């Protein structure tokens, strides 16, 4: 596990380098059972990239296959959502699901509360001046903190140590950016508190998906 | 004045404001059925709710918010608040959930509840494993309240949240932790809050598929005009 020996810069470079691409919504001019189909199809494609992203998250492959599957199983929607919020950040009042799918709230059945929360997190990130380097650290934290409470025991400890490294990385990014010590802790806290909003958003999102109606996962890991 | 508090004054304010520990109704009718246990828990929850509202009003910055925002924060946080309290109480009772000194329950006593209990016990164990301190607990609880549903007081709320962060840090420094340990523990603590949110959503899921008089209580007790509510 060279992962516990990574420096702040190495962790960032690894994470930046592992970023999935921004995918496009399926193009077909003729055509919300259709609108949800657009989002589900984007989601499925995004999932493939996410799983291979997860394998490049330092310390992730050191885990057993059982736990890798479980972490991804708990965090996938949270991860999809934070990506979405990151993409929408420079489009106030709009959610950028894809470059060719930029929806306002007016265009958002039980998705309305979801969108408003997503939009609010987007603006929150906007006024915090969230940086790409910080964003990838956060995304990684979601992956690892997803189902750690729930699930070798040593396995839990490895996760915890890597989380500590990501915390150090975040702090280092802020110090370099010239934040004072006090400012560093406050912003660390602000970022992490937004993670609970993300979890909330995911839970509500995961119980609307059930108002409708694994293999591929173990396959790739 | 709220935003003018030192760390030390902030922590003693929160400690002074702590609600009491309540006892479950003494209808000990055991063994429990689903109806009887939920009946008992709900009655406990309802009585705690009263004390929670009083507590909230003493959290620095809370009464600064509009009535609508006070109600919203409590609506969003109340179950998270009850659950963190339970986790704190159960901390020195491994394998058990101390809902009340007279209502100790283990996993083999909880039934969609089982999953929720398992989550509560895991968190409780996590608290123990990182040696969570009373001063830290009260900070986290206030953060849960102010972060549950956080347009001029979105900024006022964030100012108070910052002061609470400064207080948690200050407590860790006083304790003698290095700066690196401070940052790391702060992170570990706040990351737990995402799990508490999760357990709360799952709990609210179990409840609503089956209660507490939240809206009316807030109306009675958040009424600045009422002197002896509810
Ligand atoms: O990049 C994203 C793609 C879809 C979504 C969905 C939301 Cl906000 Cl509900 C979504 C995910 C899975 C689905 O089957 C439908 C929508 C979120 C982010
Ligand atoms: O101090 C507590 C009391 C009850 C509970 C409940 C759980 Cl764990 Cl589900 C609870 C809350 C509201 C209810 O109507 C029933 C149970 C949690 C903490």
From Swiss-Prot, chain A:
It is linked to Estrogen resistance: A disorder characterized by partial or complete resistance to estrogens, in the presence of elevated estrogen serum levels. Clinical features include absence of the pubertal growth spurt, delayed bone maturation, unfused epiphyses, reduced bone mineral density, osteoporosis, continued growth into adulthood and very tall adult stature. Glucose intolerance, hyperinsulinemia and lipid abnormalities may also be present. Binds DNA as a homodimer. Can form a heterodimer with ESR2. Interacts with FOXC2, MAP1S, SLC30A9, UBE1C and NCOA3 coactivator. Interacts with PELP1, the interaction is enhanced by 17-beta-estradiol, the interaction increases ESR1 transcriptional activity. Interacts with EP300; the interaction is estrogen-dependent and enhanced by CITED1. Interacts with CITED1; the interaction is estrogen-dependent. Interacts with NCOA5 and NCOA6 coactivators. Interacts with NCOA7; the interaction is a ligand-inducible. Interacts with PHB2, and UBE1C. Interacts with AKAP13. Interacts with CUEDC2. The modification Phosphotyrosine is found at residue 214. Residues 7-221 are annotated as: Transactivation AF-2. 17beta-estradiol binds at residues 46, 87, 208. GO terms for cellular component: chromatin; cytoplasm; cytosol; euchromatin; Golgi apparatus; membrane; nucleoplasm; nucleus. It is found in: Nucleus; Golgi apparatus; Cell membrane. Keywords: Activator, Cell membrane, Cytoplasm, Disease variant, DNA-binding, Glycoprotein, Golgi apparatus, Lipid-binding, Lipoprotein, Membrane, Metal-binding, Methylation, Nucleus, Osteoporosis, Palmitate, Phosphoprotein, Receptor, Steroid-binding, Transcription, Transcription regulation, Transmembrane, Ubl conjugation, Zinc, Zinc-finger. Belongs to the nuclear hormone receptor family. NR3 subfamily. Disulfide bonds: none annotated. Residues 1-221 are annotated as: Interaction with AKAP13. Phosphorylated by cyclin A/CDK2 and CK1. Phosphorylation probably enhances transcriptional activity. Self-association induces phosphorylation. Phosphorylated by LMTK3 in vitro. The chain holds residues 305 to 544 of 595 of the full protein. One of its GO terms (molecular function) is transcription corepressor binding. Selective estrogen receptor modulators (SERMs), such as tamoxifen, raloxifene, toremifene, lasofoxifene, clomifene, femarelle and ormeloxifene, have tissue selective agonistic and antagonistic effects on the estrogen receptor (ER). They interfere with the ER association with coactivators or corepressors, mainly involving the AF-2 domain. It comes from the Eukaryota. A lipid is attached at residue 137 (S-palmitoyl cysteine). This is Estrogen receptor. The gene is ESR1. Changing residue 93 to V: Destabilizes the receptor and decreases its affinity for estradiol at 25 degrees Celsius, but not at 4 degrees Celsius.
UniProtKB/Swiss-Prot annotation, chain B:
17beta-estradiol binds at residues 48, 89, 206. Residues 1-230 are annotated as: Interaction with AKAP13. Phosphorylated by cyclin A/CDK2 and CK1. Phosphorylation probably enhances transcriptional activity. Self-association induces phosphorylation. Phosphorylated by LMTK3 in vitro. Glycosylated; contains N-acetylglucosamine, probably O-linked. It is found in: Nucleus; Golgi apparatus; Cell membrane. Residues 6-225 form the NR LBD domain. Widely expressed. Not expressed in the pituitary gland. Changing residue 217 to A: Abolishes interaction with NCOA1, NCOA2 and NCOA3. Changing residue 95 to V: Destabilizes the receptor and decreases its affinity for estradiol at 25 degrees Celsius, but not at 4 degrees Celsius. Residues 1-230 are annotated as: Self-association. Composed of three domains: a modulating N-terminal domain, a DNA-binding domain and a C-terminal ligand-binding domain. The modulating domain, also known as A/B or AF-1 domain has a ligand-independent transactivation function. The C-terminus contains a ligand-dependent transactivation domain, also known as E/F or AF-2 domain which overlaps with the ligand binding domain. AF-1 and AF-2 activate transcription independently and synergistically and act in a promoter- and cell-specific manner. AF-1 seems to provide the major transactivation function in differentiated cells. Selective estrogen receptor modulators (SERMs), such as tamoxifen, raloxifene, toremifene, lasofoxifene, clomifene, femarelle and ormeloxifene, have tissue selective agonistic and antagonistic effects on the estrogen receptor (ER). They interfere with the ER association with coactivators or corepressors, mainly involving the AF-2 domain. Nuclear hormone receptor. The steroid hormones and their receptors are involved in the regulation of eukaryotic gene expression and affect cellular proliferation and differentiation in target tissues. Ligand-dependent nuclear transactivation involves either direct homodimer binding to a palindromic estrogen response element (ERE) sequence or association with other DNA-binding transcription factors, such as AP-1/c-Jun, c-Fos, ATF-2, Sp1 and Sp3, to mediate ERE-independent signaling. Belongs to the nuclear hormone receptor family. NR3 subfamily. It is linked to Estrogen resistance: A disorder characterized by partial or complete resistance to estrogens, in the presence of elevated estrogen serum levels. Clinical features include absence of the pubertal growth spurt, delayed bone maturation, unfused epiphyses, reduced bone mineral density, osteoporosis, continued growth into adulthood and very tall adult stature. Glucose intolerance, hyperinsulinemia and lipid abnormalities may also be present. This is Estrogen receptor. The lineage of its organism: Eukaryota, Metazoa, Chordata, Craniata, Vertebrata.
């Amino acid at each position: 596990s060279l992962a516990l020996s990574l420096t702040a810069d190495q962790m960032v470079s690894a994470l930046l380098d592992a970023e999935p691409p921004i995918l496009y919504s399926e193009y077909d001019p003729t055509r919300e059972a259709s609108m949800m189909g657009l989002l589900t199809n984007l989601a499925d494609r995004e999932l493939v990239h996410m799983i291979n992203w997860a394998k490049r998250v330092p310390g992730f492959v050191d885990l057993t296959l059982h736990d890798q599957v479980h972490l991804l199983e708990c965090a996938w929607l949270e991860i999809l959502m934070i990506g979405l919020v990151w993409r929408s950040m420079e489009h106030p009042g709009k959610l950028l699901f894809a470059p060719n799918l930029l929806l306002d709230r007016n265009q958002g059945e039980g998705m309305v509360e979801i969108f408003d929360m997503l939009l609010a997190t987007s603006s929150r990130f906007r006024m915090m001046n969230l940086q790409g380097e910080e964003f990838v650290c956060l995304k990684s934290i979601i992956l690892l903190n997803s189902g750690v409470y729930t699930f070798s025991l040593e396995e839990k400890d490895h996760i915890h140590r890597v989380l500590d490294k990501i915390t150090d990385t975040l702090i280092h990014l802020m110090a370099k950016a010239g934040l004072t010590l006090q400012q560093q802790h406050q912003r660390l806290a602000q970022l992490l508190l937004i993670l609970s909003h993300i979890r909330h958003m995911s839970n509500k999102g995961m119980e609307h998906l059930y108002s409708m109606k694994y293999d591929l996962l173990l396959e790739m890991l």
